[PDB]
Amino acid sequence: ASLRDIKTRINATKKTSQITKAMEMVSTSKLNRAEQNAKSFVPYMEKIQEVVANVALGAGGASHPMLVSRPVKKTGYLVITSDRGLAGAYNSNVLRLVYQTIQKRHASPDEYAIIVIGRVGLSFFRKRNMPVILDITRLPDQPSFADIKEIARKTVGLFADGTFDELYMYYNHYVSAIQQEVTERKLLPLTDLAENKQRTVYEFEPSQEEILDVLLPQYAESLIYGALLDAKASEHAARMTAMKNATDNANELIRTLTLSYNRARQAAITQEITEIVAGANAL
Amino acid sequence: VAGTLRLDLAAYRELEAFAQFGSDLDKATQAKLARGARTVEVLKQDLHQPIPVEKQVLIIYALTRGFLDDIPVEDVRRFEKEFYLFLDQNGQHLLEHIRTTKDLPNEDDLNKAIEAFKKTFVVS
Amino acid sequence: VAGTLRLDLAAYRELEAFAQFGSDLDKATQAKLARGARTVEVLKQDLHQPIPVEKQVLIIYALTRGFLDDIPVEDVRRFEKEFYLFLDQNGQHLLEHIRTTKDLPNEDDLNKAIEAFKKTFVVS
Amino acid sequence: ALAPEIVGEEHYQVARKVQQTLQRYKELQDIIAILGMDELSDEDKLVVHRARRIQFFLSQNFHVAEQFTGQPGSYVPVKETVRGFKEILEGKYDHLPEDAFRLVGRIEEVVEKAKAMGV
Amino acid sequence: ALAPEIVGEEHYQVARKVQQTLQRYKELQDIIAILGMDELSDEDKLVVHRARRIQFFLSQNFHVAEQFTGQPGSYVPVKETVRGFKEILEGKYDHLPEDAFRLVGRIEEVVEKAKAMGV
Amino acid sequence: LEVRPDKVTILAQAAERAEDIDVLRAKAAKERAERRLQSQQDDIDFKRAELALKRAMNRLSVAEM
Numbered sequence: 001a002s003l004r005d006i007k008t009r010i011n012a013t014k015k016t017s018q019i020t021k022a023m024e025m026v027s028t029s030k031l032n033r034a035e036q037n038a039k040s041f042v043p044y045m046e047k048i049q050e051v052v053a054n055v056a057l058g059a060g061g062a063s064h065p066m067l068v069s070r071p072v073k074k075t076g077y078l079v080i081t082s083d084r085g086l087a088g089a090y091n092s093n094v095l096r097l098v099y100q101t102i103q104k105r106h107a108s109p110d111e112y113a114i115i116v117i118g119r120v121g122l123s124f125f126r127k128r129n130m131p132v133i134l135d136i137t138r139l140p141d142q143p144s145f146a147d148i149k150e151i152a153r154k155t156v157g158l159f160a161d162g163t164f165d166e167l168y169m170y171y172n173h174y175v176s177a178i179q180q181e182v183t184e185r186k187l188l189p190l191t192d193l194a195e196n197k198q199r200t201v202y203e204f205e206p207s208q209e210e211i212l213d214v215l216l217p218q219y220a221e222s223l224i225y226g227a228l229l230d231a232k233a234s235e236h237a238a239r240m241t242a243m244k245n246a247t248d249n250a251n252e253l254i255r256t257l258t259l260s261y262n263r264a265r266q267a268a269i270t271q272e273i274t275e276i277v278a279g280a281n282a283l
Numbered sequence: 284v285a286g287t288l289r290l291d292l293a294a295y296r297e298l299e300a301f302a303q304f305g306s307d308l309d310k311a312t313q314a315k316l317a318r319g320a321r322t323v324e325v326l327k328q329d330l331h332q333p334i335p336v337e338k339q340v341l342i343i344y345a346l347t348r349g350f351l352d353d354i355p356v357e358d359v360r361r362f363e364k365e366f367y368l369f370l371d372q373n374g375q376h377l378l379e380h381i382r383t384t385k386d387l388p389n390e391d392d393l394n395k396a397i398e399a400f401k402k403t404f405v406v407s
Numbered sequence: 408v409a410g411t412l413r414l415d416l417a418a419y420r421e422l423e424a425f426a427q428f429g430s431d432l433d434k435a436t437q438a439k440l441a442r443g444a445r446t447v448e449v450l451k452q453d454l455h456q457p458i459p460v461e462k463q464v465l466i467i468y469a470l471t472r473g474f475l476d477d478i479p480v481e482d483v484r485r486f487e488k489e490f491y492l493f494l495d496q497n498g499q500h501l502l503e504h505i506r507t508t509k510d511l512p513n514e515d516d517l518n519k520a521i522e523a524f525k526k527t528f529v530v531s
Numbered sequence: 532a533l534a535p536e537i538v539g540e541e542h543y544q545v546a547r548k549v550q551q552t553l554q555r556y557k558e559l560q561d562i563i564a565i566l567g568m569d570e571l572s573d574e575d576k577l578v579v580h581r582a583r584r585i586q587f588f589l590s591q592n593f594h595v596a597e598q599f600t601g602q603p604g605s606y607v608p609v610k611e612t613v614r615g616f617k618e619i620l621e622g623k624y625d626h627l628p629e630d631a632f633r634l635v636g637r638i639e640e641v642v643e644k645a646k647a648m649g650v
Numbered sequence: 651a652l653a654p655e656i657v658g659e660e661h662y663q664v665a666r667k668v669q670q671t672l673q674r675y676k677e678l679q680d681i682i683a684i685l686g687m688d689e690l691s692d693e694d695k696l697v698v699h700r701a702r703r704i705q706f707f708l709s710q711n712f713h714v715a716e717q718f719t720g721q722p723g724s725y726v727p728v729k730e731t732v733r734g735f736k737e738i739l740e741g742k743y744d745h746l747p748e749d750a751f752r753l754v755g756r757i758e759e760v761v762e763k764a765k766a767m768g769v
Numbered sequence: 770l771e772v773r774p775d776k777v778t779i780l781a782q783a784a785e786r787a788e789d790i791d792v793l794r795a796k797a798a799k800e801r802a803e804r805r806l807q808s809q810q811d812d813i814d815f816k817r818a819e820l821a822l823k824r825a826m827n828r829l830s831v832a833e834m
Contacts, residue, residue, distance in 0.1 A: 005832060012825065012828045019822050020822070029306065047780065051780075085429055086566075145782065146783075146797070246566055330655070424823070424827040425684055428572065428575075565829075685813070685816055
């Protein structure tokens with residue numbers, strides 16, 4: 001092609017590479033902050049988990065409605081997706097898994113309901129006209145417990161009212177900067193608890209049920225919050241990796257365009273000098 | 284004095300394309316951007332106003348040693364213009380030493396001179 | 408009608424650059440893109456089928472005044488053909504007015520004729 | 532010769548639609564090369580999906596080429612080609628792998644190859 | 651000729667400030683077109699607010715253009731232009747309507763037109 | 770509250786130090802404005818970056834070569 005066209009294409013590719021590199025740096029900083037936020041949550045989670053373990057499994061206590069495996073006729077689905085793109089296959093993987101799971105074992109819109117977090121998941125479910133009942137969008141890059149507590153307690157109360165007998169969480173689990181694993185988790189009823197290594201017993205100032213009925217919803221909300229933090233960390237890592245790959249692709253394109261430019265330059269010089277010499281010889 | 288200036292400008296020029304996106308790494312990158320912006324502001328000059336080498340050396344020393352890190356970017360030109368007058372009024376010994384020996388004066392002397400000038404400068 | 412047609416087409420061309428990928432656009436830009444798509448559909452023409460100017464001005468008037476905003480994009484060509492056929496039968500007076508005076512007829516009559524045709528027309 | 536009054540209306544429409552899809556796929560090349568398939572919309576993803584199949588189905592096994600590959604080759608009538616491309620444009624074979632469309636001949640051979648591949 | 655030695659210090663400063671404001675306004679065209687006006691920061695919207703006034707005040711009514719519009723036309727000395735653009739940059743006329751600055755000439759005519767529109 | 774003879778801990782979804790329950794609800798209400806502002810800024814930054822990327826890609830595409 002023309003030399004000027006190749007030069008313009010090279011300049012445009014360089015601009016795109018710069019933009020992608022800046023986006024990657026921003027994503028790296030946000031990933032570091034998200035990791036700090038996630039690690040800030042451990043002491044509360046471990047303590048509430050061990051308290052639930054040694055209370056719910058002590059002196060029986062299995063009679064609580066959220067502990068028994070009652071027969072299921074409606075199933076809940078909690079899906080955590082991003083509000084923004086450029087994350088690669090982050091949203092598509094979890095959405096595809098949710099769709100495949102729903103189509104495999106329900107085959108009826110009355111058997112399930114969907115709770116979705118994020119714009120992309122809401123749009124994906126609304127395009128297929130599937131029954132979304134709860135949704136939250138435009139979460140901050142570093143969400144707190146306050147802005148998720150409302151929906152967490154709403155879905156816990158929705159289960160407690162008997163609307164659906166079982167629900168699952170679908171989200172991306174942050175393994176490393178390169179690896180993010182889609183995870184399916186059964187939130188509740190708590191069919192099993194990781195019994196702690198200490199195994200004590202406490203006196204109950206209320207009755208045991210009067211303590212469990214307050215403790216268990218807090219445990220479910222804590223689980224939801226932990227899943228959300230993990231999803232945010234994985235989203236930031238995925239965006240960082242995608243931007244790095246885009247920058248590498250742009251660099252390779254520039255590398256090939258440079259060779260094309262050199263060939264065009266040599267050809268142009270040869271043509272010009274040949275024309276000049278021919279014009280000189282014509283006299 | 285030129286060694287630090289060269290490195291500062293080189294570091295700033297590569298990071299300039301990423302400045303419009305705000306916080307990237309506030310520990311180091313933000314300092315680099317501010318230092319580079321002040322360096323760019325210092326090197327600007329007007330027509331038909333050559334500067335003696337000693338004043339250039341002193342202003343570059345002030346820039347590189349961090350005395351301008353608190354001055355806002357928009358006031359660097361006026362800071363330099365007033366600093367030249369301050370040096371004319373009170374810094375004659377430093378200028379004479381630089382002219383005679385072609386070397387920097389005693390560090391504490393010009394540090395104190397710059398601090399005294401900064402005591403009088405008012406930020407707009 | 409040419410100025411409005413040109414402005415709509417230019418706006419569509421400008422806005423189309425930001426709809427290739429990524430996040431979606433807001434509703435006003437969606438309406439502008441739909442209008443531009445209908446404008447592009449209108450300008451298509453078959454081989455060896457010249458159109459009299461008095462029908463071109465009428466179809467462009469119908470497009471620019473928003474009468475095609477509810478017609479699906481895939482039906483615009485058939486709408487134009489059936490509109491020409493309708494004008495051949497019931498729009499003769501205003502066709503003659505355009506031919507003789509070289510000027511656009513009353514807005515009231517054009518609106519009545521277009522609404523009558525839209526009442527007659529059936530979408531796919 | 533590609534005119535409605537020479538080859539028929541259906542042939543002309545199918546050819547024009549195929550060319551339109553291929554043109555759109557060519558336009559999306561820079562975005563696909565840099566940012567990948569993830570950033571495309573649903574409409575563009577389907578366009579790429581069908582364009583890959585259309586591009587692979589245009590390939591054919593020749594009788595002369597049997598000396599190179601050992602495959603006997605095939606002769607395809609025009610109506611069969613038109614019907615196959617019309618079916619592909621309608622999404623009837625969106626579930627088949629794209630490798631089953633290479634050097635295949637008729638459209639039924641695509642299904643046979645896909646079945647032999649384990650689909 | 652745009653140098654302080656030729657046109658003076660005040661003229662040079664006013665011209666440089668106008669150029670900087672107009673250049674800043676140009677960088678926000680895509681953001682305003684796509685994201686919208688309400689997303690801008692306070693300083694950015696002040697910049698565009700003054701940039702619209704500056705851009706409209708650069709228009710003028712010409713003597714030979716009278717037959718187009720019927721306005722007599724005006725001849726503006728260079729002294730008046732600098733004063734008017736300095737006054738606009740200071741925010742002295744931020745309260746006037748945007749259309750008062752179109753095709754007027756001297757800065758007093760902006761106030762006259764705004765009064766004629768009933769400001 | 771969970772108590773141990775050598776360890777005492779209480780788990781709270783929200784906590785403050787003024788002991789005025791009106792101050793707690795005041796802080797909870799005031800945090801809402803900060804949350805909305807942070808979410809809006811996070812959205813707008815990404816939108817601006819995406820616009821820059823879109824313009825660059827459009828220029829690259831129109832430079833088809």
